[PDB]
Design a protein around this ligand. Structure first.
Ligand SMILES: C=C/C(C)=C/[C@@]1(C)SC(=O)C(C)=C1O
Ligand SMILES: C=C/C(C)=C/[C@@]1(C)SC(=O)C(C)=C1O
Lengths: 403, 403
């Protein structure tokens, strides 16, 4: 029935491990840089939320030859989670009660585009090769991790655009609740490339006025925000059944006491708000303790930002929780955003502090009577909430509490 | 607690609705044709499992601007399932207890490539446009249906390659069991294009020796099968809680009495057998009636075919059910294969007959343990099983029974 997080792993724009990520968060350090690749592709947005790591010989050649970047990022995060959970092969491999639910928002537009380019070349099929399917397939993140880690339980991905890894964790929780699994590795990954980024720029979703000052581009709630800053990376958490965890002396960050998954059924590319309201309310249902901190989806987009503020306010009313949008620091890793931000929230719960909402030179008047924390402040948190939304009116909310 | 199917919709290579599909099945009619597109693309495989329907104007212009083919196919299938189920707008729209779980195997390689191609032109972003994200993103099938159809419940896709739509239905069942939803539209869609097909051909997965005789290319269990015949299309079923279905007098096809979801944790692109055995057995927990008919995944590939037959052998021993691989007729629609074949199984349960396993000119030596019906056989069926597997060692099994 009860699901808890007993391990985490992360490869992000602000850190290649939970320790480095902790640093950046408490420091309020930006992971955004100028991208030549993006500028070079023809894009208007030239700022990145890139992973600063040379992944070259980190994954075995036979295993890595099937993967794309989203898979690599999630695979490395999974290793970190396996290690950090205290799990050994004999404990998680070839075991029907151990599963994997992880995905990405866009799969691999790079290798999808590589296979097409290679195919139209004079060598066609031979230029494409036998590994494009596993690299480009939408289920790449799950397929590429489940096989090498010899997972025997559930094995699939959930895709809900900018909310995918959040739904992945919520689904893992349901597997434990249904008594189907004891452990489920949940999370996701996302590649960073002009191939996919250009699509978002094409719809005017990305920031384009701060290319000269990359670290100031992502400015959630700032009156002059102009779109989100795309990013790549991965994250993975170990969702485990309470008794099982306690039984093996597992270290427990918190327990997932709430999971909301709703739908807007209104517009694509634009949030309705009511959808998020029901989602958050659903995640708080039964939680007998108040929400101390709220890690908003806050993408730094004109409409989105205030639309979520309007929702939060209607759900909490007078008594609103402390809020901070860590995207102003990290950027929007799309499909990886959900798990990565759940991890930042878990780190804040574990280290008693609230990461700051940076770059707010001018608070939006639409973000009036709320509590946007712009200073790294030490606080004994107990219950935290994380929101994730994506195109198509898909919403997810996770509420985590200490034991 | 209990989940039943109260409506279905389908757009496939053998039919544009349940009536045409029924006729083709009973007749063992091939939906395979020669593809100039694939031939012109430089592929060794020139046979198609195409949808014979010009979809132009079949969807509101403002609504279809966000969709790719997989989304269109699923959207049309859902239009059918809604009407079939006898659901009125007021019954399923703007309702938190009504959800949508549908996806595809590859999303939209065509629009991932179009975005990249347009980007590298003299028009760049202007040529790309603002609708490529929703078309190219992995969650397209779910995002593009949930919004127009006014869905307020769950909204996301499950992606497990050639098993995705099967896992989608299984997940919908869990939502009903967890008491979270009363109705969940489950299924998926898949586009047909050289962009995605060349990648499979590039790994030698597609049939290439029967281009001169398209209808004989897909030959599951035939000693001379040489890969699967790619296809496109959609399918959607209405998964509904039992008391709910009966309360409104919905017409129930069958109840989902079993859902297995396992993982191989062995090889990519190649099945282990073990895993599919646990998946079937898992689907069988609680089911005490015999399996009267088994709609195998049977892709018409050398290894796959006999690896699944070995697993079926292992699960049933001396008591093996009647088997038939409808892919020899329809082709492999990848992500849509699961829901489409669940529908064929539902149609056979409904009209009392077993669709034939066509093109078996020889029958692999390993298939000696017969009961693979190669002739349309009228028979009163009660419990049927459908298998779905995909790259990455992901397995799904659904068992449906008459009420
Ligand atoms: C239905 C549309 C939604 C939820 C849109 C949001 C707020 S979610 C997101 O990640 C970005 C960039 C947005 O603009
Ligand atoms: C792990 C690999 C698996 C399950 C491979 C299968 C049998 S699934 C499928 O649709 C095809 C074409 C195959 O070859």
């Amino acid at each position: 029935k009860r699901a808890v997080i007993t391990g985490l792993g992360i490869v992000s724009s602000i850190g290649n491990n939970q320790q480095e990520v902790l640093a950046s968060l408490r420091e309020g350090r930006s992971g955004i840089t100028f991208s030549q690749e993006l500028k070079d592709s023809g894009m208007r947005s030239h700022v990145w939320g890139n992973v600063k790591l040379d992944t070259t010989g980190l994954i075995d050649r036979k295993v890595v030859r099937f993967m794309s970047d989203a898979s690599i990022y999630a695979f490395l995060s999974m290793e970190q989670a396996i290690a950090d959970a205290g799990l050994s092969p004999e404990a998680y491999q070839n075991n029907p009660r151990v599963g994997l639910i992880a995905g990405s928002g866009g799969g691999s537009p790079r290798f999808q585009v590589f296979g097409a380019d290679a195919m139209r070349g004079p060598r066609g099929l031979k230029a494409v090769g036998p590994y494009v399917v596993t690299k480009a397939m939408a289920s790449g993140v799950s397929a590429c991790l489940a096989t090498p880690f010899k997972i025997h339980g559930v094995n699939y991905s959930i895709s809900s655009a900018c909310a995918t890894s959040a739904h992945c964790i919520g689904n893992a929780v349901e597997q434990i609740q249904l008594g189907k699994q004891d452990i489920v590795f949940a999370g996701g990954g996302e590649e960073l490339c002009w191939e996919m980024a250009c699509e978002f720029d094409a719809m005017g979703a990305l920031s384009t006025k701060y290319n000269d000052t990359p670290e100031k581009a992502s400015r959630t709630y700032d009156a002059h925000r102009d779109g989100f800053v795309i990013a790549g990376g991965g994250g993975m958490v170990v969702v485990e059944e309470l008794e099982h965890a306690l039984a093996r002396g597992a270290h427990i960050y918190a327990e997932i006491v709430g999971y909301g998954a709703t739908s807007d059924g209104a517009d694509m590319v634009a949030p309705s708000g009511e959808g998020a309201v029901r989602c958050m309310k659903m995640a708080m249902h039964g939680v007998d303790t108040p929400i101390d901190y709220l890690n908003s989806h806050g993408t730094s987009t004109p409409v989105g930002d205030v639309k979520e503020l309007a929702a939060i306010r209607e759900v909490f009313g007078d008594k609103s929780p402390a809020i901070s949008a860590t995207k102003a620091m990290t950027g929007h890793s799309l499909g990886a955003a959900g798990v990565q931000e759940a991890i930042y929230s878990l780190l804040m719960l574990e280290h008693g502090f609230i990461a700051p909402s940076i770059n707010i030179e001018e608070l939006d008047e639409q973000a009036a009577g709320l509590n946007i924390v712009t200073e790294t402040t030490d606080r004994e948190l107990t219950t935290v909430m994380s929101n994730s939304f994506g195109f198509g009116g898909t919403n997810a909310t996770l509420v985590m509490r200490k034991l």
